[PDB]
């Protein structure tokens, strides 16, 4: 078979084909924003791909992997609303997280799972037949320390912490938007933390706030998914302020 | 660590004393099983490289087994660094071997004496079980207990005085090494044939035999 | 080009190009002299460098403190064999308890280097290695090249423009056995100077020297520890 | 074309319309690039004579590795790519090593040659590893079936010979062996005979300048494969020089 | 179906020539060796001040007393470091002294060319490291900084700067640093050089500074600690 | 609460002690045996019983605590380090064991103390002692106990324990090693002889 | 300290090292417990053209070792044209095997003495059931090590190496003493010498008798 | 793209986005319609079997609708050859769940176990992607009767009315449209099942040779799953038939 | 003798549970202040009682496992299922060279089968019933629940029954009154009750 076709070929680009290509998928389907707050680090998703006859319990676009770490994603590829690829990554990352607790106790830190996940996609680049996952997850959480962290991973598997980061529907666009809204005030106040998430989502608003699902997660405590009904309360008021800036 | 069958109850003691600018290490060259001597040659001191000399004692097989392990690490670290290493490396590599045989440990005591790559001449004791320590003076083996009282009164001097109330001088320690070896021959029934004393400057060994029987 | 993308594509000559292309890396890489007397084995190496704010690349490597190698070619492939060889030594004292014969190891590596030249697409190792060693038999200067073929040689020189060194070794075939540790080293410098232009000679900072023999164990000499060996500057023709 | 040099050798998982893959035919060409190795069989041993191509006179023994010691009664003289020469040496030898342990006796050559031949063909089948491309001979003196000489080519064909030569001058050499006698006569008379064939065949469009190496494996060396002594080598060579002229 | 490695007619691997070009795209790493420590300075490659300078994997620990800085492909580096890391921490457990920075450098250079798949090996890579590394750590002979690059060239360094312009990174090193001088000034020189290869002007946010000393050993810096070393531009 | 290796919790410091020679056997290996060791530089330990048993778990621990620290680049919970030790000693159980560790290190709430046992327990408690003979130890220290111990008061406490324990017991020997940890910086307090401490107190 | 109850034993292997040769005597008798099943038995083997091996104690444990040393020797000679293996690597690697099998508590001892020259030196090596390698002036293993070796030691004590004639008188003295003192054996010895061509030692023959102390 | 970098799943896409899955979705459309409707005392599955031919041995009534477990049944739309490994796999998982949990297995749990195997085949191991969409029908006591849809890729969703096969787009919208919620009964969902199955399919007649119908009905609190036999099937068809006939000329 | 004391009294919905703190090794209480009652979740609590090592090791593992199930289904683990689930776990573990045997009590409220309280034997025999004890105490605690109530009397009177049972703990077996860890587990979570 051709040289270009093969999984082995480091290409004139100076970087492996399958690693490069997975990186060009992190826009479109679904949207995940996470901002950092003192008392809650909050992730919100827009589009769970629900017709509202489809169970919303089955599709997790916001899944808690630990008892203080949670992640929300988005991605590009063939066939819409695609639960599968994201779902394998939840299953291996969540078990590993529970196994970490068993080995070395208490809720596992935000930064460690994020390091594990970035390396998980990386090892695959050596491994036979395997390309890396095209996913960027906004790992949102609190450490056991209680030091809030907001982390993001990329498809090659390089990770960075941020104060606030947004992906999907054009990653670059939502990152840029979120930077106007973010302020040092926003992080201190419990009302503003939620609105900051919602504020990035809305520039590709679809179907109410019932479509948009938010969670708050606290220092050692399980994921609390705020009602699909509560979210709507923020959106009605905020959406008006949103139109003016763009 | 026991040898009525499983391991060799081949007797033999080495004693090494560090002053602070020599090590004298003295051991018998008799290889025996039980009270009987097998054969009169073969020194129980063995040099891993050239710049280090270890004394291994107890069963002879256990002694050959320990030196190999200490030797394969002693070269590896030298290769890597591109400069030699000595006393400190032998003790510290024993830690790794001792972990290796966690379930039933090798009944050999190796004491590496030479000069370490951290400076000053060192005769270090690991025992085959685990554990590491630096000693002031130490004699080790199945007759370990017999050197210890000589070193304890002189070197440690814990509510005691001897020649000087300080870790003993080079002239005294070399005499002390020769002395213990005569005494051991009467008391113990495994020590026999001749006693070979190796004095290490930290880079080179010199050997002198003394007959006793 | 096409033969070497794979390996299973055989040529119209009947010889694989992947091996031939691998030989050309050895021509890119550093000039080396390896010579033996019959008591000693000397490795005289040319060091190359990327920065002169950084210390010039050590081209005598410790495999064991009795066999050492000097590398010419791909550095990554070299280091891979360096480690492989190092472990083999460790293994040899561990089980056998002696200083490893050079002869047991060249043959062992020669078995191993053949395997990826036969594996589909995989390299033959684009590095030629000169192993200088003194074991219980006496000195050996061995060549492993990208071809699994090895030579037992008294003196050979591999690397960039080493051919010019090889000619002077032929004149002095007689002198080698006869020579002392000092004398054999001065010939290695003579051989090494040929490699370089007729505009210039050797400096202390681009020469690395490795001595193993009867007189002393394997010690590698760096940047300015080469000096007592170094003195002896002979002819370079135009 | 009876072979294509690009197409049907892209993988080692191919066949060709005649019935034989082109990679194997190329592997016969690889052996042509090197000099000749002759080995003539007695009933008291085998004697090899290989010409070894030289580029320097700083070469010492255990260089090029034309003679390998497969066993303490099995000898091997090889021809072709020296790189390839080492793996074929391993394959024969490992088979020998397992055999010695378990069976506990000297190997019959009738079994070894077919057994090895399977292995040589087995690389050709696979595309995990490429065909071999050096050719070798096995010559043995044993009490197991006597002195026997086989030749195994990189295809994986094993055949009997009283006289085989593999090289680029194998066709010209084999005919030359048939004219001489060596079939019934001792290794001591034969050594002289192996040397002369190499000089007479020796062309300047099939070979280059060489130093002679000859080898024993017979009753004189007491089974075992050793190289002939320098003194003996030089008398066998002295006849070889005289015979050309 | 196909091979793995492809030699170019020039006599060198195609994939290895590509791997050098790989280096030009990423972060920069400068390490400066003093007999009082080895400092490693690297940029994360900023684009927003929302990106924390507090905890970012560009300078990572091989050992408790060895830090390693990466340039080129960042992501791939973390896998090289992990392999070196397992070897190094086993050696540290055993020796309780120091794990030679030089050995570690020699070990990683093996991972550069080893790669096989397509009927060779499932355990070996499908790519070459286009990572170049600066291992800076503290050892018994003294503090040492070693340079490795995609070709696998292990060399000892007193001072080396490597970045998205290899010629650029070093040339700034010539101007500013000289081998022997205080610890404080070695850090000072890392930052100036780092700013030069980089697009934008120096700030606390754009870089992470980690110093490995025989006196303090590896320290991963947080934002308050970063402001201190920034003072000396 | 066992052997002449003790640790007890209080918020000001933790004092960690072991002897030179707590009688791991009937004899000394050489002239001087050390038990009091920290291959770390932010954690404190206890450990008694056999010779082998304390040396292995703590050297095993050094590797395990750095390995997590190395990757994540911020120090891990005291609980994460202690659970790591706990899993490992359980493997080690039954081949040579009576060993346990008492962990002190900085965690999220503040300074943390977890005692991990040779069984497989991770518990916090007022006082633990690692090895086999603190069963005879408990009272005197137990009479003058409080939750909070001052820096000054902790030293008076250990000093006296060894002096009374010469009278009652004998397994106490050679030197008393005292180490005080602020929370992540241990300092060597006094290396006072067991005999010497009998004389004063 | 160990010695399994041997079934099939070779009791004695004599050995004295001289200047380029070794003289070895090897017991002809193979005791299978009390019954002497087989005399004809040479326990000295030919590995290669410059090595030899002679062992005493269990003969079964010996036959397992001769083929194994045969495959180790076959790997090493391949590398040269006439290279032969040195005594020390093969004997030391086997030492590590016996130290391991000793720890396994049901096992049978054998103790072998190798003579080779593969270096620039003539090596006399031993692998024992207990294991160790050493040089020796004159050697004997197993039942020789226990009772004649001490007689040999007595001799060795003021005169470091004996003469040819004196070693012959001792041999003759020795065979009497073993039949008299140990059981299983016989007087019958094979004289085996190893040299640079291989090992030569024809079939075991009867030699001097004296199980008489009626005369004493 | 301008050329795929696929030809194996041990090598991957020139975009990193997998074309093969979109061809798999098309594959369900090639094969006959599979539909599931919800009931208030059961759930039923209706599928079009591969066999339309008159000559049928009829030892099996299960040849696309396989009863897996004592609580759940699934159906196939796609290639029949693929079901056979899958169906035996599903039996193992389904009983595996009972062993530990011993609960009326939920539909969401069985489907996630299977999705692990399908996602791996597409990523590596050199195994060709699947071309079947499977519809799982089951009962749990925590939400009720459920229907789930699984895709070749590993993509899943809980439904209570879903259809795939014989142009998916049309079929799912239509199945929804005619579906009512909380107005249902098992007989009427079954009569309706044939009617919708008729419209998506080219045939305006339909027989038990063409079609195979299964019930899952809960009796005395336990789920009894049967795939029905031909005479029973025919009766549901004839019920529908009178209406179909009036549509026709 | 089997193991130290436990007394557990299910009300009729509520279950009030107690175990001693006293985790003793050699002849001292190492711990005397920690609960070896585990929160595997908020809707389910598991309380593991046995030896020193098997208690902490089996439950910590179970806990991390409980959380994993929760994510997957997105509903709390089912109570009926949890009762059979704990039986497979303790039989599988039981062969291991380090001995695992647990006298367990699962307490949960589920919206499925309902409430469950599980008596579980040392022979890895699973039964739901109302009244359980731990140690050789299981016979001692089950017996006072059969006569004095019909095991539907108030939690307050049950506490008085518990005080009387604890007095036995001073008499028949060795444990001292000093510390006992007491928790009542109902639908909301665990409530800390007074120490004895």
UniProtKB/Swiss-Prot annotation, chain D:
The modification Phosphoserine is found at residue 243. PANTHER family: PROTEASOME SUBUNIT ALPHA/BETA. The modification N6-acetyllysine is found at residues 57, 206, 230. Its main location: cytoplasm. It is found in: Cytoplasm; Nucleus. SMART domains: Proteasome_A_N. Component of the 20S core proteasome complex involved in the proteolytic degradation of most intracellular proteins. This complex plays numerous essential roles within the cell by associating with different regulatory particles. Associated with two 19S regulatory particles, forms the 26S proteasome and thus participates in the ATP-dependent degradation of ubiquitinated proteins. The modification N-acetylserine is found at residue 2. Transmembrane segments: none annotated. GO terms for cellular component: cytoplasm; nucleus; proteasome complex; proteasome core complex; proteasome core complex, alpha-subunit complex. This is Proteasome subunit alpha type-3. The lineage of its organism: Eukaryota, Metazoa, Chordata, Craniata, Vertebrata. InterPro entries: Ntn_hydrolases_N, Proteasome_alpha, Proteasome_alpha-type, Proteasome_asu_N, Proteasome_sua/b.
UniProtKB/Swiss-Prot annotation, chain E:
The gene is Psma5. The modification Phosphothreonine is found at residue 47. InterPro entries: Ntn_hydrolases_N, Proteasome_alpha, Proteasome_alpha-type, Proteasome_alpha_type_5, Proteasome_asu_N, Proteasome_sua/b. It holds the Pfam family Proteasome_A_N. Keywords: Acetylation, Cytoplasm, Glycoprotein, Nucleus, Phosphoprotein, Proteasome. One of its GO terms (biological process) is proteasome-mediated ubiquitin-dependent protein catabolic process. The 26S proteasome consists of a 20S proteasome core and two 19S regulatory subunits. The 20S proteasome core is a barrel-shaped complex made of 28 subunits that are arranged in four stacked rings. The two outer rings are each formed by seven alpha subunits, and the two inner rings are formed by seven beta subunits. The proteolytic activity is exerted by three beta-subunits PSMB5, PSMB6 and PSMB7. PSMA5 interacts directly with the PSMG1-PSMG2 heterodimer which promotes 20S proteasome assembly. It is found in: Cytoplasm; Nucleus. One of its GO terms (cellular component) is proteasome complex. The keyword Lipid biosynthesis does not apply. Glycans are attached at residue 190. Its main location: cytoplasm. The modification Phosphoserine is found at residues 8, 48, 55. Component of the 20S core proteasome complex involved in the proteolytic degradation of most intracellular proteins. This complex plays numerous essential roles within the cell by associating with different regulatory particles. Associated with two 19S regulatory particles, forms the 26S proteasome and thus participates in the ATP-dependent degradation of ubiquitinated proteins. This is Proteasome subunit alpha type-5.
From Swiss-Prot, chain F:
Induction: Down-regulated by theophylline (THP) and up-regulated by 1,3-dinitrobenzene (DNB), two reprotoxic agents thought to induce infertility. Keywords: Cytoplasm, Hydrolase, Nucleus, Protease, Proteasome, Threonine protease, Zymogen. The keyword Transcription regulation does not apply. Bortezomib binds at residue 49. GO terms for biological process: proteasome-mediated ubiquitin-dependent protein catabolic process; proteolysis; response to oxidative stress. It catalyses: Cleavage of peptide bonds with very broad specificity. Its EC number is 3.4.25.1. The active site is at 1 (nucleophile). Its main location: cytoplasm. One of its GO terms (cellular component) is proteasome core complex. It comes from the Eukaryota. GO terms for molecular function: endopeptidase activity; peptidase activity; threonine-type endopeptidase activity. It is found in: Cytoplasm; Nucleus. Signal peptide: none annotated. Belongs to the peptidase T1B family. The 26S proteasome consists of a 20S proteasome core and two 19S regulatory subunits. The 20S proteasome core is a barrel-shaped complex made of 28 subunits that are arranged in four stacked rings. The two outer rings are each formed by seven alpha subunits, and the two inner rings are formed by seven beta subunits. The proteolytic activity is exerted by three beta-subunits PSMB5, PSMB6 and PSMB7. Directly interacts with POMP. Interacts with ABCB1 and TAP1. This is Proteasome subunit beta type-5. The chain holds residues 60 to 260 of 263 of the full protein.
From Swiss-Prot, chain G:
Keywords: Acetylation, Cytoplasm, Nucleus, Phosphoprotein, Proteasome. It comes from the Eukaryota. Induction: Up-regulated in cardiac hypertrophy and hypoxemia. One of its GO terms (biological process) is proteasome-mediated ubiquitin-dependent protein catabolic process. It is found in: Cytoplasm; Nucleus. The keyword Phosphoprotein applies. Transmembrane segments: none annotated. Its main location: cytoplasm. The modification Phosphotyrosine is found at residue 57. One of its GO terms (molecular function) is lipopolysaccharide binding. GO terms for cellular component: ciliary basal body; cytoplasm; cytosol; nucleus; proteasome complex; proteasome core complex; proteasome core complex, beta-subunit complex. Non-catalytic component of the 20S core proteasome complex involved in the proteolytic degradation of most intracellular proteins. This complex plays numerous essential roles within the cell by associating with different regulatory particles. Associated with two 19S regulatory particles, forms the 26S proteasome and thus participates in the ATP-dependent degradation of ubiquitinated proteins. Belongs to the peptidase T1B family. This is Proteasome subunit beta type-4. It comes from Rattus norvegicus (Rat). The lineage of its organism: Eukaryota, Metazoa, Chordata, Craniata, Vertebrata. The chain holds residues 45 to 260 of 263 of the full protein.
